[PDB]
Design a protein around this nucleic acid. Structure first.
Ligand SMILES: [Mg+2]
Ligand SMILES: [Mg+2]
Ligand SMILES: [Mg+2]
Ligand SMILES: [Mg+2]
Ligand SMILES: [Mg+2]
Ligand SMILES: [Mg+2]
Ligand SMILES: [Mg+2]
Ligand SMILES: [Mg+2]
Ligand SMILES: [Mg+2]
Ligand SMILES: [Mg+2]
Ligand SMILES: [Mg+2]
Lengths: 75, 101, 72, 140, 247
RNA sequence: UUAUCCAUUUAUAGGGAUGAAUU
RNA sequence: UUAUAACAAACCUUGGAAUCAAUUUACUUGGAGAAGAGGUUCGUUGAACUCAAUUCAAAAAUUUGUUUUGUAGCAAUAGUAAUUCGUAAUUAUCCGAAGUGGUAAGGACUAUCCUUGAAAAAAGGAGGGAACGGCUUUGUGCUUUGCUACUCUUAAUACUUGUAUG
RNA sequence: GAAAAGUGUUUAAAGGGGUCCCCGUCUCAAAAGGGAAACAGGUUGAUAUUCCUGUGCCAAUAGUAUUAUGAGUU
């Protein structure tokens, strides 16, 4: 229907620290298990540190298309 | 959910758990029990230490033509349960006493 | 134990099939008083009559499958 | 002036209708052996229309927005009068009749009142603030 | 020798706190989005005695911003707080007795209590009955703030660190003499078993450095080094001066 | 700052301008 | 929920208080509404009160007067003290005033404390408004079409399900 | 910590409640704290708020189908 006052909501709600907030995703905040968390942190650590040349050379990993082509050829 | 390919332990023996014969051992004489039998149609049985009230009732039903309204029990200091069994009004404990012996 | 004062209520109670026994008592008052007790599965309902004939009539009225206990 | 003119909306403060909002229909202010207090006579809403979404189907919406009313004579000292006045949007004499307060079919009258309220809510008009106020359940 | 009274205390057996009747720990709010960016108001629903403490507590109810429900904090009550007063906490709170603000946002001279020394610490300094700290300055760099604690010590804290404007309730409780031994009995009976204190000098040598002698006297200097061990650290520990304080 | 360390909470909105509050 | 009565409180309506008043053993209380007048409730208590019944007579769409019962029911059938009679049964009794304040409990209060005097299981109440008749027919638990006894609720009864009361 | 033991959320992927979300160490510790419900009389050589007579009280009481009991809605 189309009536002004049957469907009128008082949705102008959000000011800080008053009324329950709306909602967010929270993935950033969930605690996670110890393992998996360490892996996450490990990755970060790896990124962060000065990586020696040899080790670095183990992550320049071709272009995707070319790799796929190579794989196909090998097949 | 379990799905064992064969069961762990299979007691093929006849059950050790106490049947009617073994659960309820014998009636009591003694002046007290005789009096009980006379006056208020309560039969007194010595029973196994590990008899429940339900169990005793069941035993009585099986072993005799007895219907029991109520069963009180107690553990004697001789390591036996003594079960005071009050019969329903339809039965005369005296008659049933006679029947048993 | 409950008391009853509406004769009709008492009668209704009597009519109801869980009422196994009636107890009818005679009491020398300080004339013959009569207490009518019905023994229901739940409660023992009692009516007191000052007047003997009335009491008698109500007793007569009571269903003849009731298990009447004349106390004294 | 005389705060409680017929049609003014009020909030009951006392009784079973504690925080319910309602329209006064006929003020008396004459103390008697029967009612020794100035009393107001009020037609109000007990159970407001529940919140409704556009998505919902029309029958279900109608069911949702049923409004269960009541008619009660009440001491003026128990009612908080509001600025809101609904003399216009209802024919007020038609809501509650003094004589019918006594009468047997009071429930029928109440039902009728409720129906009227529902109708009003359905057709708002332009849109009065008073009617909006009446619509919303008071949260306390 | 034997183990001295002091040493026994650390094992905490009978020398643990009498924790039973206490209403809970007194702590500020968790440091949420609210308190960091704006203000939250709560009701002081009741002001109450917490037994072993000298300062009354305020049960303050806040409404949780992330779930529908009321949750209770235990605040230490500043003088002048009352039941049904609103207490507001946050960066953009207003400066009233009772409210909880980052020290950065209070002008110099303001008087505060329940002060977090690190942000998020849930409030740690100036809690005793009567006490208050003073904001003495905020640096032109912003960031840190200089406070003066009840001791006299001046300390530098983060400006984001929270505090409570006003002075703690039950002030001057030390003004009234205890008079009776029993009133002291009752005081410690609610805290921990630190009372009666027998004098080392009244003990035997097995029991205390001061113990023994045909005279009741300490016999050796009663200023002991910082770097003493457990049973030595007994008189005036690490004393820079001694005697009637002139300064 | 990433090791390390401490704190805080349900690990609950990235940084700036004396009622109710939930589907 | 023992029914009522009486009483300390708490609240409601009315009423509008200085020439202050009510009021306790004590002080407590009052324009944030006192006294007075009428009510509501909890708590003590557990038959107080005409409490209930009945007796008949008069007034409204049921209330007043008089009388007889009931140890209010439990309850007299039980206890107690008697009295006989028999070799277990009958009878008669069991009721009219009040004081003391030892003990216990409850009440309303008042005072002391740098002492402010456990918790939980369990229960309850409130706020909130999720969800919403039944049967029959059609299509992929959901939607559409047609009809009016329905949703609760205790208690009993029956029948399968391991033997459905301690 | 060689273990034996010592500490008990300190850096856990620690069973319940609703229709995936929401809670959340476990366990023992009171025969004087908390707590479902009982009274009288009678009876034995010896037990009794426990047996007997009487009178109650408490908590359960699965589903389906009838019955009745009353409510509410037309
Ligand atoms: Mg036993
Ligand atoms: Mg000293
Ligand atoms: Mg000393
Ligand atoms: Mg000595
Ligand atoms: Mg020594
Ligand atoms: Mg000496
Ligand atoms: Mg000396
Ligand atoms: Mg007698
Ligand atoms: Mg236990
Ligand atoms: Mg106990
Ligand atoms: Mg004995």
């Amino acid at each position: 229907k189309d009536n002004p006052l049957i469907f009128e909501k008082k949705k102008r709600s959000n000011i800080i620290g008053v009324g329950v907030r709306p909602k967010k995703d929270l993935s950033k905040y969930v605690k996670w298990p110890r393992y998996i968390r360490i892996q996450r942190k490990k990755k970060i650590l790896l990124q962060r540190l000065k990586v020696p040349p040899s080790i670095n050379q183990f992550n320049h990993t071709l272009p995707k298309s070319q790799t796929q082509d190579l794989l196909n050829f090998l097949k | 959910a379990r799905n064992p390919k064969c069961p762990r332990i299979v007691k093929s023996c006849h059950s050790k758990t106490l049947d009617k014969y073994g659960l309820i051992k014998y009636p009591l004489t003694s002046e007290k029990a005789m009096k009980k039998i006379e006056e208020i149609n309560t039969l007194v049985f010595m029973c196994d230490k590990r008899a429940n009230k339900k169990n005793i009732k069941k035993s009585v039903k099986n072993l005799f033509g007895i219907e029991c309204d109520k069963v009180n029990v107690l553990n004697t200091l001789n390591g036996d349960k003594k079960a005071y069994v009050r019969l329903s009004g339809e039965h005369d404990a005296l008659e049933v006493a006679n029947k048993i012996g | 134990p409950k008391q009853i004062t509406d004769i009709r209520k008492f009668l209704k109670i009597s009519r109801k099939p869980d009422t196994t026994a009636v107890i009818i008592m005679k009491k020398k008052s300080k004339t013959v008083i009569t207490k009518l007790k019905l023994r229901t599965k739940k409660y023992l309902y009692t009516m007191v009559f000052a007047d003997r004939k009335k009491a008698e009539r109500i007793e007569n009225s009571l269903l003849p499958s009731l298990k009447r206990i004349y106390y004294p | 002036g005389k705060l409680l003119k017929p049609g003014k909306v009020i909030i009951i403060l006392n009784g079973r209708r504690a925080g319910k909002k309602a329209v006064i229909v006929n003020t008396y202010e004459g103390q008697t052996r029967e009612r020794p207090y100035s009393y107001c006579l009020v037609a109000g809403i007990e159970k407001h229309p529940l919140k409704v979404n556009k998505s919902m189907t029309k029958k279900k919406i109608v069911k949702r927005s049923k409004v269960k009313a009541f008619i009660k004579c009440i001491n003026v000292n128990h009612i908080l009068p509001t600025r809101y006045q609904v003399a216009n949007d209802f024919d007020i004499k038609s809501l509650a009749s003094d004589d019918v307060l006594k009468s047997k079919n009071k429930k029928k009258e109440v039902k009728k009142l409720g129906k009227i309220f529902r109708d009003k809510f359905l057709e708002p008009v332009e849109v009065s603030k008073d009617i909006s106020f009446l619509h919303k359940k008071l949260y306390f | 020798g034997r183990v001295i009274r002091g040493q026994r205390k650390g094992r905490g057996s009978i020398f643990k706190s009498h924790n039973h009747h206490r209403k809970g720990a007194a702590k500020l709010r968790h440091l949420d989005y609210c308190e960091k960016k704006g203000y939250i108001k709560g009701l002081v629903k009741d002001i109450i005695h917490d037994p072993g403490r000298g300062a009354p507590l305020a049960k303050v109810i806040f409404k949780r911003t992330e779930k529908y429900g009321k949750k209770e904090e235990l605040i230490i009550a500043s003088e002048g707080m009352f039941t049904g007063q609103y207490i507001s906490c946050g960066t953009k709170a207003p400066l009233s007795v009772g409210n909880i603000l980052p020290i950065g946002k209070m002008p110099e001279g303001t008087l505060i209590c329940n002060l977090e020394h690190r942000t998020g610490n849930r409030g740690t300094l100036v809690k005793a009955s009567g006490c208050y700290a003073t904001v003495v300055g905020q640096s032109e760099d912003g960031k840190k703030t200089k406070v003066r604690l009840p001791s006299g010590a001046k300390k530098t804290i983060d400006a984001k660190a929270r505090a409570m404007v006003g002075v703690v309730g039950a002030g001057g409780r030390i003004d009234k003499p205890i008079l009776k031994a029993g009133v002291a009995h009752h005081k410690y009976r609610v805290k921990r078993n630190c009372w009666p204190k027998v004098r080392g000098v009244a003990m035997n040598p097995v029991e205390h450095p001061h113990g023994g002698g045909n005279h009741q006297h300490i016999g050796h200097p009663s200023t002991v080094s910082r770097s003493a061990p457990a049973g030595q650290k007994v008189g005036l520990i690490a004393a820079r001066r001694t005697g009637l304080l002139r300064g």
